[PDB]
């Protein structure tokens, strides 16, 4: 409890969960899953700007700094902003935005391979 990462209230501003199962992860994992599941997203949608991000579908490429830095650029620091963003203006959870993006992309849940769901927080 001294340094437990939930606060006293067990806040999970970055956690996301699937309502179809008990699977849950965070925003960085969601971004990684989105980059890995481009083929499914592109197939559902259906040299070119559309496929420009395909190279990032490789696990080894992402593990390499060449891909890790791209991952960290895409997934910035939602909990870090300007210094004036304090008190009543502290950052809020972007879990809603991430869930909306995932649902619109129709990315599949790793544990149940569903299509929708992916509510905010942790179930």
């Amino acid at each position: 409890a001294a340094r437990r990462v939930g606060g006293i209230g067990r806040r999970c501003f970055l956690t996301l969960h699937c309502s179809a199962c008990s699977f849950f992860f965070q925003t960085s994992d969601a971004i990684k899953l989105i980059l890995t599941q481009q083929h499914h997203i592109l197939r559902k949608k259906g040299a070119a700007s559309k496929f420009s991000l395909l190279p990032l579908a490789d696990a080894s490429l992402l593990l390499k700094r060449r891909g890790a830095l791209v991952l960290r650029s895409l997934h910035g620091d939602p909990l870090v902003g300007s210094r004036r963003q304090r008190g009543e203006f502290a950052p809020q959870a972007p879990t809603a935005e991430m869930a909306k993006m995932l649902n619109k992309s129709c990315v599949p849940c790793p544990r149940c391979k569903r299509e929708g769901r992916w509510e905010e927080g942790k179930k």
């Binding site: 606060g7 006293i8 806040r11 970055l14």
Partner: peptide
């Protein structure tokens, strides 16, 4: 800014729910 304030911001992130290291590396 100050190292103490940087650590405070990291602790705030941890309380909000982001596991980040406290090492001053």
């Amino acid at each position: 800014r100050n190292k103490k304030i940087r650590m405070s911001l990291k602790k705030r992130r941890r309380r909000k729910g982001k596991r980040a290291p406290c090492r001053k590396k």
